[PDB]
Amino acid sequence: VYADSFVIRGNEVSQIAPGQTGNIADYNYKLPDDFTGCVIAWNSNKLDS
Amino acid sequence: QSYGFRPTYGVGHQPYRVVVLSFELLHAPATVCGPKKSTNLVKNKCVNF
């Protein structure tokens, strides 16, 4: 099992997915099209403000 | 959930149109038959029916 954690903006929460294109999904973090597993995302505006 | 397809997807992810044929050949009246010409019917003589 591999787990990776980070923080991203609101408009890019759905950007990290196979077949997606953009800045974060291509230049910082890209998933392979055959990736198995899934992503967990939740708001942290109270703490990271 | 979404089952989209990309042409850039490699083998194991390309769409595969599949049709299954289910037969029920059993002791019942026949409706679907092949292209076998029907011959005359003979009685009281050994034949390969």
How many whole angstroms separate alpha carbon B23 and alpha carbon B19?
13
Which residue reads 């992503």 in tokens?
A39
Query: Chain B residues with CB inside 8 Å of A34's CB?
Result: 12-13
Number of Cβ within 10 Å of residue B36's Cβ equals 6
Under 8 Å CB-to-CB from A33, ≥6 apart: which residues?
A18, A19, B6, B9, B10, B13
Taking the alpha carbons at both ends of chain B, their separation in whole angstroms is: 54
Method: cryo-EM
Q: Which of B6, B10, B12 sits opposite A19 (nearest CB)?
A: B6
How many whole angstroms separate alpha carbon B26 and alpha carbon B43?
25
Q: Which of residues 10-49 of B touch A (CB under 8 A)?
A: 10, 12-13
How many whole angstroms separate alpha carbon B8 and alpha carbon B28?
49
Query: Chain A residues with CB inside 8 Å of B4's CB?
Result: 19
Closest CA–CA distance from residue B8 to any residue of chain A (Å): 9
Q: Token pair of B46, please?
A: 């050994």
